[PDB]
């Protein structure tokens with residue numbers, strides 16, 4: 001509760017379960033990556049861009065969730081507006097996806113991996129598009145369920161976007177490279 | 179400003195630069211992975227655990243910062259309390275590191291990469307330990323610096339923990355595997 005009067009063991013016991021749920025969920029990514037071992041081995045450069053893609057997804061979603069949590073608190077939006085938020089946000093995500101995808105493809109050209117120009121460009125557009133929706137809809141789901149985002153919203157978006165982020169990336173990679 | 183009366187283009191134009199700043203910073207991770215291409219080549223399974231390790235780092239650090247941002251706002255702590263938070267938090271981080279390390283090491287055994295058991299296990303302890311300190315100190319650093327931690331920290335911790343997290347993991351990889 002009160003940090004100034006909490007000891008190491010006390011803080012450890014207060015924080016541990018939430019991180020443990022997050023890592024147990026987090027391990028699924030390693031299972032997904034093992035299933036794509038052949039493309040990873042065939043083209044080593046595929047591994048180079050996993051953090052940037054997943055990270056850009058998580059940034060997009062947490063920016064998205066932060067706006068929605070704000071609009072819900074100020075009663076600017078209500079829970080019935082999730083149909084409207086969804087339809088508008090898939091426009092914003094397309095725009096953000098193409099924009100950021102343009103930058104990252106330029107980095108792949110600089111690195112000189114022509115086989116990965118379509119793989120990365122397609123993936124980030126889809127990753128940003130989908131991570132944007134996940135961020136926008138979590139505040140609605142949590143509020144409908146009596147949960148306050150502060151502790152929960154940010155790592156939930158990050159972990160969701162990592163799994164859906166890999167699933168998109170390696171699938172596009174398996175398709176275009178094999 | 180107000181989400182309900184902003185259109186897709188307005189929403190994109192208002193969000194784009196911050197995401198663009200984040201991805202240009204994020205590209206450093208790909209350069210780092212390229213500098214370790216040989217260790218990536220030596221053991222394909224190394225790539226399998228990059229999202230989990232970096233993801234667990236970001237979770238730990240953002241949990242830590244949220245606690246500190248709370249204590250500073252409710253003024254249980256002020257900016258001068260930073261040495262004690264540091265000394266206390268390196269106890270909490272060690273405990274959190276050993277705990278999550280035990281879980282992730284168990285997953286590496288399940289995946290059947292005995293050769294990677296010490297590399298991953300050691301790396302997660304270091305990643306959790308340092309990311310926990312980073313989270314606790316940014317609210318102190320940001321406030322002393324005329325920045326409000328609340329608005330920026332969450333993607334800030336995520337990007338720091340990805341770079342430092344990659345640097346720890348791959349370095350441990352050459353030391354034990356090369």
Ligand SMILES: CCCCCCCC/C=C/CCCCCCCC(=O)OC[C@H](O)CO
Nearest residue numbers: 024027028031280281282283284285288289
């Ligand atoms: C003490 C340590 C406990 C942690 C150890 C966890 C064991 C694996 C389960 C992971 C659940 C989440 C990820 C989904 C798991 C997919 C399982 C898998 O990898 O199956 C491949 C296997 O080699 C075919 O027999």
Ligand SMILES: CCCCCCCC/C=C\CCCCCCCC(=O)OC[C@H](O)CO
Nearest residue numbers: 079080081082083137138139140141142144
């Ligand atoms: C595209 C299929 C969408 C359905 C998939 C659901 C899974 C989560 C996704 C969005 C909902 C987020 C949860 C928000 C809870 C909303 C409450 C609701 O349904 O509101 C409409 C209105 O109130 C009734 O009259």
Ligand SMILES: [Ca+2]
Nearest residue numbers: 041042044219
């Ligand atoms: Ca290879």
Ligand SMILES: [Ca+2]
Nearest residue numbers: 058158236336
């Ligand atoms: Ca992340």
Ligand SMILES: [Ca+2]
Nearest residue numbers: 219220221222
């Ligand atoms: Ca190889």
Ligand SMILES: [Ca+2]
Nearest residue numbers: 044215216219
């Ligand atoms: Ca070679």
